[PDB]
Amino acid sequence: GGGYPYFIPXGXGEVNXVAEX
Amino acid sequence: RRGSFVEMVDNLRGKSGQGYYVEMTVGSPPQTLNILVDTGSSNFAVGAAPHPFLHRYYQRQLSSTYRDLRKGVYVPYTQGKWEGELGTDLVSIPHGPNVTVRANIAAITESDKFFINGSNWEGILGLAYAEIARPDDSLEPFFDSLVKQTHVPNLFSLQLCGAGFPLNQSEVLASVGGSMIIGGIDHSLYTGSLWYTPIRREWYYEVIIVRVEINGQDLKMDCKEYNYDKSIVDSGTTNLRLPKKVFEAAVKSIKAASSTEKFPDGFWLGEQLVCWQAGTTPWNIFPVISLYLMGEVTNQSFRITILPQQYLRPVEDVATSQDDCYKFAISQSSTGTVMGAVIMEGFYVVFDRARKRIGFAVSACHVHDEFRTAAVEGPFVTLDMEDCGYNIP
């Protein structure tokens, strides 16, 4: 009824450093 | 103190997904700030006004050496942006060389989605070249000012450790750390040989990817796809970011190799974490990924290979300590390949500006297991490498 692996919402948690030009 | 390399070892800290920072001091008397190390931009900028997420900020009025340039600046990133006031001041790196530089500094007065709640950094050190500085290439970047005013050799190297970072038992679970060696290369941070790829053009640290393999199987794209519209090495980006078409081929191949076809699509898109019981993450079902880079001699390449421990990133504070949860940290880009922390945490990376080249060696601190290790291998014979670069058509 449960089990591994399981998936939960989330993510982001990133840096993404300059736009071109 | 002498500013020797041993003093610089371990001078970076971070929280996972929030960049790596070095301590700096600005102004007279010195004001201490933590500064994100960003090889993907070229402005030095610091929080200079209150913000809910800033523990501290730069106070120009407290510095007798501050000089106002009377010009504004706006800087947009792939994520986040800020604007502020240009000026110059004296700057030092307490665990860096033993020197004091007069540098350009953007004093940040407004920002959006730039500072991160709880992050421990208050500014950014853009280490790339003047061509991508704002407002334009006349604003000399920090590292240029450092080299011009001092005798520091024109190179730096980065060892980003990720969860390979020695911590006390009582330190916060997401803490990472590393080293920025300014002015040279420290032999304690890597094993084996350093292999170099040319810096294609000095704007970003642009490089050329000539082949991609997953699980030792060629992705079989035209190599121009890997570098569309550039490929860069970026300490201020978390993920390995890939052009759309390459991303889609990468996911297909990773799924096939690991038999995870049934994992939900949100996982692959970075909208859902995967969770296993603590200690039981099945690393061995996931493939290694290799990027072959243009080498230093005609028709010669080498490859860097990372493990699932680099591209499945641990996420704390989302489930019971009884479980280990991960974010898939390979993602889509419409601005070219970015070799972010996912790539750099496998390797000691030397930004050899003096020789227009980037070196990679296996990092002494990369996360791996008893069966596999990150690798840097060559040489390989590879034809038509120059054709791999993008040109405005």
mmCIF file of N, CA and C in Angstrom, chain B residues 2 58 60 103 116 171 186 221 229 240 282 292 298 304 350 379 382 385:
data_model
loop_
_atom_site.group_PDB
_atom_site.id
_atom_site.type_symbol
_atom_site.label_atom_id
_atom_site.label_comp_id
_atom_site.label_asym_id
_atom_site.label_seq_id
_atom_site.Cartn_x
_atom_site.Cartn_y
_atom_site.Cartn_z
ATOM 1 N N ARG B 2 50.969 34.822 4.776
ATOM 2 C CA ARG B 2 51.719 34.859 3.509
ATOM 3 C C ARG B 2 50.850 34.799 2.208
ATOM 4 N N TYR B 58 26.462 45.947 2.735
ATOM 5 C CA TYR B 58 27.527 46.917 2.626
ATOM 6 C C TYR B 58 27.018 48.355 2.890
ATOM 7 N N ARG B 60 28.175 52.031 2.451
ATOM 8 C CA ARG B 60 29.151 52.850 1.787
ATOM 9 C C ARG B 60 29.524 54.022 2.650
ATOM 10 N N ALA B 103 38.648 47.819 -6.453
ATOM 11 C CA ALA B 103 37.824 47.141 -7.474
ATOM 12 C C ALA B 103 36.533 47.908 -7.691
ATOM 13 N N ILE B 116 18.679 34.610 -1.404
ATOM 14 C CA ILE B 116 17.930 33.374 -1.095
ATOM 15 C C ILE B 116 17.715 33.366 0.400
ATOM 16 N N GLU B 171 26.780 20.226 12.731
ATOM 17 C CA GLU B 171 26.532 21.185 11.620
ATOM 18 C C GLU B 171 25.267 20.830 10.827
ATOM 19 N N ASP B 186 46.543 23.808 -6.376
ATOM 20 C CA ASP B 186 46.986 23.162 -5.142
ATOM 21 C C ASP B 186 46.828 21.647 -5.350
ATOM 22 N N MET B 221 24.179 12.449 -31.294
ATOM 23 C CA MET B 221 23.650 13.669 -31.904
ATOM 24 C C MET B 221 24.762 14.280 -32.696
ATOM 25 N N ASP B 229 23.501 27.461 -27.921
ATOM 26 C CA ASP B 229 24.305 28.361 -28.718
ATOM 27 C C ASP B 229 25.728 28.577 -28.097
ATOM 28 N N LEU B 240 23.509 20.424 -14.232
ATOM 29 C CA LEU B 240 24.002 20.263 -15.607
ATOM 30 C C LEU B 240 22.783 20.682 -16.497
ATOM 31 N N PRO B 282 19.855 3.059 -4.783
ATOM 32 C CA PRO B 282 20.466 2.054 -5.619
ATOM 33 C C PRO B 282 21.317 2.746 -6.722
ATOM 34 N N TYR B 292 32.889 14.532 -23.656
ATOM 35 C CA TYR B 292 34.218 14.632 -24.266
ATOM 36 C C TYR B 292 34.395 16.073 -24.620
ATOM 37 N N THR B 298 45.739 18.959 -32.104
ATOM 38 C CA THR B 298 44.891 18.633 -33.268
ATOM 39 C C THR B 298 44.267 17.249 -33.165
ATOM 40 N N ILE B 304 35.411 13.721 -19.368
ATOM 41 C CA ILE B 304 35.117 13.782 -17.974
ATOM 42 C C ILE B 304 33.860 12.939 -17.751
ATOM 43 N N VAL B 350 40.513 24.017 -13.212
ATOM 44 C CA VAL B 350 41.473 25.094 -13.220
ATOM 45 C C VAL B 350 41.078 26.044 -14.340
ATOM 46 N N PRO B 379 44.346 10.391 -23.908
ATOM 47 C CA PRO B 379 43.755 11.180 -24.973
ATOM 48 C C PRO B 379 42.879 10.322 -25.941
ATOM 49 N N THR B 382 39.807 12.423 -32.146
ATOM 50 C CA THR B 382 38.462 12.906 -32.510
ATOM 51 C C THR B 382 38.568 13.895 -33.657
ATOM 52 N N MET B 385 36.507 18.575 -34.730
ATOM 53 C CA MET B 385 36.077 19.166 -33.472
ATOM 54 C C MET B 385 35.675 20.617 -33.620
#
